[PDB]
């Protein structure tokens, strides 16, 4: 926000080692543990009594898959994140009730799990860029609330 | 940490609000609500335009917890725990809305209190609603 | 990011009531008070040692003037924000090296003042409106950081 | 606060880090200046650039009092106490800035510590850099 042209070109070439389903599997889980008020919206997904049971819970995992499948898709549009996210946002914000900084949260979990998975590929620049990204996705999401 | 004259501002302030808290209360969520449209995410199941019941109701029963507060300053979190424990474990509102609130019920303050709200006073506020707020966050995580 | 019609008639109709000496020296006084670690950047101000000090401070109320001027002279623009304080932006990143979480804190203490000031005319809409114009001042100001 | 087992968990993983201490907190800064530029408006006076002698040594005394920390989990007010008067009385950060650092931290131990970075691990040191925040901004005000 804004990127510049080296920095899209980071983004896309670390995304494409990525494995969006067990990467969202991993980022919603750890968003679950690490700010547990984050299970609000999650009452029917089962059992969330420990770390491991978050983690390896198969309706976390979907849900995972379902939000970084969109996030993912959504990394061909860096110049119209609004665009892109405006009917999810209307949706997260009239029947969801998602608070967005939730988005925020989820970003941050993201950055953490890229550093884990990448190590010392997740360069501070890298980093840097994912942060707009993260960023700029969360305020797309935020944008139609009201 | 607050400090005597900090204490001693907060029951000042507070004590000229006196029955009306109630209704600041209520004044400072519909505050937030209009500043703040985020925080409406919480409160699907009220009606949150001017006036409403529900949202005065809810004001009564922050105003009560701050009353209590404020008697309890030197011993808030055992005071708060019950509320603690149900924003932590049930409402579960992220602890970034509380400086929203806090914020509003500032702004409240200020629009009642011409003579009260000097600037000393405001800081003492300021400190007293931020450990209020630090003290109903404390139970998250 | 943009005001109702409404909006705007509520932010022009007040601050025509508003002396913008008085209440510019009344916020940044305030600021220094209630955040006491902004007077980092007042070193040369002299005596901030208590709020009464702080608040009839002669330098404290020049520069308030000075500052809610400039916010003054930007209401007049509120459709371009960016690009009115652009300039500004760029001098309190590269040469005064000001945080912009304090534009922030600002508008929080400005929307204090207009209340107490005020009284029951601030009104929860009126609120708001203020509320969008102190944030998306802030944005401006801190815009041209990097 | 931290439970007994976000004591055990920061202890193990923060000691693995050992000798690097130094290393991973002038990782963690520069993560920071980049993510973050506005935290760039503290440091007017550094060369920034990388591998610079400021901030390797800035990371090593930021790792230390981390270090200084986890050895007094139990008391990390007395032990921070003279860090606490510095930010708080002299340098003057705002509040906001330590969440950033706080992030770029954890950051760069997910970045080296892939065996220990479990869901666990990363609450527990989330919570202490969180908690270790709170006490360095406890004397602001
Ligand atoms: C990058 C951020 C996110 C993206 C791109 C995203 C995307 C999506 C998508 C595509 C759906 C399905 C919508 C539909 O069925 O029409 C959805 C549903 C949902 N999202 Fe989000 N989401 C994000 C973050 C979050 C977060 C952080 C939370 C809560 C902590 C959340 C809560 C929910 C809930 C509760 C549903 C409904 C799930 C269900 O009915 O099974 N979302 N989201
Ligand atoms: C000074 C800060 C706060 C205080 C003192 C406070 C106090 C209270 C009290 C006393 C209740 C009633 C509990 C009961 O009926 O048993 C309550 C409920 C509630 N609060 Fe908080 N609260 C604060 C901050 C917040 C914030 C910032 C939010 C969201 C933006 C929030 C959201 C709620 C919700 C959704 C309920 C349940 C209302 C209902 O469904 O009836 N609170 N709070
Ligand atoms: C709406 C927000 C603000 C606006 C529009 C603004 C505008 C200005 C203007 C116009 C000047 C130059 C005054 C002159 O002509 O001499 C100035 C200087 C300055 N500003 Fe800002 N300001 C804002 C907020 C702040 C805040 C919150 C701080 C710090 C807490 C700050 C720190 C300074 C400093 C240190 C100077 C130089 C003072 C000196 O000469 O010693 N500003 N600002
Ligand atoms: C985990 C949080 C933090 C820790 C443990 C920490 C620790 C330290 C330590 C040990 C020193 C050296 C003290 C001395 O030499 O006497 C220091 C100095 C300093 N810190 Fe903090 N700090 C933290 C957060 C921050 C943040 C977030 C900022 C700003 C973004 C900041 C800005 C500074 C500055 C400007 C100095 C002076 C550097 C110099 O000129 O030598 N600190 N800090």
């Known amino acids: ?146 | 940490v607050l400090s005597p004259a900090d204490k001693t501002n907060v029951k000042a302030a507070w004590g000229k609000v006196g029955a009306h808290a109630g209704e600041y209360g209520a004044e400072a969520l519909e505050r937030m609500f209009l500043s703040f449209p985020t925080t409406k995410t919480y409160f699907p199941h009220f009606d949150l335009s001017h006036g409403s019941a529900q949202v005065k109701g809810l004001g009564k029963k922050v105003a009560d917890a701050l009353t209590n507060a404020v008697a309890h300053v030197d011993d808030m979190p055992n005071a708060l725990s019950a509320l603690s424990d149900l924003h932590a474990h049930k409402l579960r509102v992220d602890p970034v809305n509380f400086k929203l609130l806090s914020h509003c019920l500032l702004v409240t303050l200020a629009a009642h209190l011409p003579a009260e709200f000097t600037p000393a006073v405001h800081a003492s506020l300021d400190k007293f609603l931020a450990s209020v707020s630090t003290v109903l966050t404390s139970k998250y995580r």
């Open chain 1, 1 to 146: 926000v804004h990127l510049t042209p080296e920095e899209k070109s980071a983004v896309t070439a670390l995304w494409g080692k990525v494995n969006v389903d067990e990467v969202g599997g991993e980022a919603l889980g750890r968003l679950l543990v690490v700010y547990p008020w984050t299970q609000r919206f999650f009452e029917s997904f089962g059992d969330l009594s420990t770390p491991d049971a978050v983690m390896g819970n198969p309706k976390v995992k979907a849900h995972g898959k379902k939000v970084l499948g969109a996030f993912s898709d959504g990394l061909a549009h860096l110049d119209n994140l609004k665009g892109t996210f405006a009917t999810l946002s209307e949706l997260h914000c009239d029947k969801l009730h998602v608070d967005p900084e939730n988005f925020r949260l989820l970003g941050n979990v993201l950055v953490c799990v890229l550093a884990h998975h990448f190590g010392k590929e997740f360069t501070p620049p890298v980093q840097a860029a994912y942060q707009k990204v993260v960023a700029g996705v969360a305020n797309a999401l935020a944008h139609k609330y009201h």
